[PDB]
Design a protein around this ligand. Sequence first.
Ligand SMILES: Cc1cc2nc3c(=O)[nH]c(=O)nc-3n(C[C@H](O)[C@H](O)[C@H](O)CO)c2cc1C
Ligand SMILES: [Cl-]
Ligand SMILES: [Co+2]
Length: 116
Amino acid sequence: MEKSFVITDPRLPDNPIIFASDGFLELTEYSREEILGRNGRFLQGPETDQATVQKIQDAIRDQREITVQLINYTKSGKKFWNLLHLQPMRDQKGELQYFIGVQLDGEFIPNPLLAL
Ligand SMILES: Cc1cc2nc3c(=O)[nH]c(=O)nc-3n(C[C@H](O)[C@H](O)[C@H](O)CO)c2cc1C
Ligand SMILES: [Cl-]
Ligand SMILES: [Co+2]
């Protein structure tokens, strides 16, 4: 699939998605029009590890890059492992301008090891 990413605007409330790639639409099965403005946690669901969610929240607060692997759900309810790479983007004035999150679909780290 084409590269899956979203870009959010941290200068607006709770990191709304302002751009979603064609690859993100294809991975997640959502249309662009129905994604724009939402927070990326819409992909989460029952099996998502809340301890991983909290690591993400802390990295965003700290404006630090992080990679986590977590369960996400397509629009039709199919589970997938998402290796999510979140990166703050600063402008030439040193000010936070975006976050970008790149999603790779796969159980890269086996769940029994992820859990240790
Ligand atoms: C740019 C960006 C992309 C994100 N992409 C995802 C994602 O693909 N899946 C997910 O479960 N959370 C994602 N999140 C995390 C989610 O939006 C939220 O920050 C955490 O769930 C903590 O509330 C993303 C966050 C940002 C800022
Ligand atoms: Cl957050
Ligand atoms: Co591909």
